[PDB]
Amino acid sequence: SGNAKIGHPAPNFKATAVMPDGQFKDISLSDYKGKYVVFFFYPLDFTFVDPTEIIAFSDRAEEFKKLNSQVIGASVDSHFEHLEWVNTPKKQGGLGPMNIPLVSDPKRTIAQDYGVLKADEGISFRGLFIIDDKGILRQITVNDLPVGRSVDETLRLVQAFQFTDKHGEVSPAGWKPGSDTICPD
Amino acid sequence: SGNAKIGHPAPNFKATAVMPDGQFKDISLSDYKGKYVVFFFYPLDFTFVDPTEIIAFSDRAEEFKKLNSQVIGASVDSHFEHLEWVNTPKKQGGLGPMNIPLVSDPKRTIAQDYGVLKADEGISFRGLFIIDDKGILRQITVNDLPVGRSVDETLRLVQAFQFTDKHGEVSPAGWKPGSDTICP
Amino acid sequence: RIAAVHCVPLSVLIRPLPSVLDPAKVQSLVDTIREDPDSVPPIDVLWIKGAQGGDYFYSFGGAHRYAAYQQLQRETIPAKLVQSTLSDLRVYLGASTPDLQ
Amino acid sequence: RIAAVHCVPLSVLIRPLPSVLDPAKVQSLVDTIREDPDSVPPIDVLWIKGAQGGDYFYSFGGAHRYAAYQQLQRETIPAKLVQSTLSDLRVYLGASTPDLQ
Ligand SMILES: Nc1ncnc2c1ncn2[C@@H]1O[C@H](COP(=O)(O)OP(=O)(O)OP(=O)(O)O)[C@@H](O)[C@H]1O
Ligand SMILES: Nc1ncnc2c1ncn2[C@@H]1O[C@H](COP(=O)(O)OP(=O)(O)OP(=O)(O)O)[C@@H](O)[C@H]1O
Ligand SMILES: [Mg+2]
Ligand SMILES: [Mg+2]
Numbered sequence A: 001s002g003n004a005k006i007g008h009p010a011p012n013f014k015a016t017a018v019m020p021d022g023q024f025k026d027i028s029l030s031d032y033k034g035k036y037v038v039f040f041f042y043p044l045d046f047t048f049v050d051p052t053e054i055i056a057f058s059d060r061a062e063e064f065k066k067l068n069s070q071v072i073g074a075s076v077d078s079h080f081e082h083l084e085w086v087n088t089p090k091k092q093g094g095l096g097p098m099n100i101p102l103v104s105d106p107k108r109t110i111a112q113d114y115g116v117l118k119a120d121e122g123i124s125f126r127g128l129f130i131i132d133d134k135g136i137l138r139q140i141t142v143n144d145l146p147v148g149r150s151v152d153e154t155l156r157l158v159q160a161f162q163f164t165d166k167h168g169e170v171s172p173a174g175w176k177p178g179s180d181t182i183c184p185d
Numbered sequence B: 001s002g003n004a005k006i007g008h009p010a011p012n013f014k015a016t017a018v019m020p021d022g023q024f025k026d027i028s029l030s031d032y033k034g035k036y037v038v039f040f041f042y043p044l045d046f047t048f049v050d051p052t053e054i055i056a057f058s059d060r061a062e063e064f065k066k067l068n069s070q071v072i073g074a075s076v077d078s079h080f081e082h083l084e085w086v087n088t089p090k091k092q093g094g095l096g097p098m099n100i101p102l103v104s105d106p107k108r109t110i111a112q113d114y115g116v117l118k119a120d121e122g123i124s125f126r127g128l129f130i131i132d133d134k135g136i137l138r139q140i141t142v143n144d145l146p147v148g149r150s151v152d153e154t155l156r157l158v159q160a161f162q163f164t165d166k167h168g169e170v171s172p173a174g175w176k177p178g179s180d181t182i183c184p
Numbered sequence C, D: 001r002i003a004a005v006h007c008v009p010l011s012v013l014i015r016p017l018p019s020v021l022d023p024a025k026v027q028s029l030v031d032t033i034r035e036d037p038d039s040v041p042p043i044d045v046l047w048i049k050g051a052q053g054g055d056y057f058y059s060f061g062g063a064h065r066y067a068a069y070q071q072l073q074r075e076t077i078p079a080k081l082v083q084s085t086l087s088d089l090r091v092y093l094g095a096s097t098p099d100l101q
Helices: A052-059 A061-066 A079-086 A109-113 A151-166 B052-059 B061-065 B079-086 B109-113 B151-166 C023-035 C063-071 C086-096 D023-035 D063-071 D086-096
Strands: A014-018 A024-028 A036-041 A069-075 A102-104 A126-131 A137-143 B014-018 B024-028 B036-041 B069-075 B102-104 B126-131 B137-143 C006-009 C043-049 C055-059 C076-084 D006-009 D043-049 D055-059 D076-084
Touching (some): A036 A151, A052 A061, A052 A069, A052 A151, A137 A151, A151 D086, B014 B079, B036 B151, B052 B061, B052 B151, B061 B069, B061 B151, B079 B102, B151 C086, C023 C063, C043 C086, C055 C076, C063 C076, D023 D063, D043 D086, D063 D076
Parallel strands (some): A036 A069, A069 A102, B036 B069, B069 B102, C043 C076, D043 D076
Antiparallel strands (some): A014 A024, A014 A102, A036 A126, A126 A137, A137 B137, B014 B024, B014 B102, B036 B126, B126 B137, C006 C076, C043 C055, D006 D076
């Protein structure tokens, strides 16, 4: 659903995020042009399951940075609630300190744009989107609520897209087929 | 676009497929109720790139069978074209013999239903869909054309959904909290 | 949370999501529970009523504490009960949410 | 598809998709190319025109054959040229397709 279409500009958003330094900032996806973006949703802050998946993406943020890529998480919870969760010990089911921004989507409009809203619950599914350095959507991943995403799979995808992107830096050949270029016997 | 929504019945289709025995059969997604289904699209038969990912899902079909899951591939090409490709050597960019059925979607309606139609080109993106044994859509994966899908990742997802599905086979506790159940 | 700490039988706890156990952390908690059980906080348990009033108890955290109690072959584990609904369950389970009776 | 077999300089071929090479298969092709080159069929090369008539040559198959010619320090590789459009290219490359001039 939504307006997220492969090969098209990823839907832009402007939203209040909790930055890795713990400050609030109003950010837009378009701020990250020039870099690949891994943009992922999760349903809710402060549930009874540990945010293992989020901690894994933040823990391995260096592997994304090595690929010139920015990871950004989002949920429908307020940015105040994101910061509370950051400031909650992991042994109390908290996130702990984050190496990635966490976007707040309290109007559900970003989730709807990305077609990942679970309407009967008012929360996002586990959607993950790979957006290239030109802002173009390259990959859609959406899981039902019980099953997490893999950092290894995500890094595989980012590197494969970038490999092919980089091989598009080409110049005209300066070789022309003709009667002269037929292979000798 | 399309009608594929997580937690809802996967769009049914009826289509002519080429079966692992090389025969044509009209099949419906709903024929596979009771089994997990991995339904994947690919753009076109007979392009200049080897169909490595299709061969991988076919080669590893036993790992899916072990999970009571059926893998099905699809493109907009005719079933006649699917069979020619099956009968083309891999050294000639062919598929070789397949352990999985290949659905034909020449009207592009299945691709449209699953929201993976690249409408300008009239071919499907690399979409892959995990459908549970009740026919419910559990997972959406769509790649832009140049990047393939992982059999290892797909099996990871199937087993993870099935893990939590199996934990839904429960009956009531027969234990009631009250003043008698406070810890001493 | 319901007021007090309840001793929930391990056999009634539904643990529908996978977790990675560190055997050394399990052993460490086994040791602590024997020595100073009050230092090991209660886990959180969601108490859900089925359509016909059946009782269901879901555990989504405290994996290592649960492993340690099963190792000790305890009948019950200290828990805080959280009265919850099917709608709350579906946040965790999605289309794996059973039609609880 | 263009009729004869053309000897395409290795250096002009654009190979934008990754391939996994088997070194023993590369080496086996090296030896065959030396002994009986006629038994190693041409690779298929897509000849695309840029917006301003630039020439581009894409190789999507024949990874082992290409590596074997490289190993052999050959200038060109036998190839069938297939005249193709930017639309054809976009099938392979999606939003990685360059604005070829
Ligand atoms: N020896 C011990 N080892 C680990 N934790 C202990 C120990 N003794 C007491 N604790 C307490 O028990 C709780 C264990 O919580 P922790 O989040 O580490 O694991 P868990 O919740 O049981 O399992 P998981 O977090 O993997 O689901 C913490 O409050 C911790 O302070
Ligand atoms: N020694 C050899 N080893 C492999 N193939 C050979 C050899 N000699 C001739 N051939 C022929 O060369 C062609 C090689 O095709 P093949 O599909 O195996 O590899 P490729 O197309 O060069 O690389 P890849 O398929 O990995 O992209 C086949 O037609 C094969 O019959
Ligand atoms: Mg814990
Ligand atoms: Mg080949």
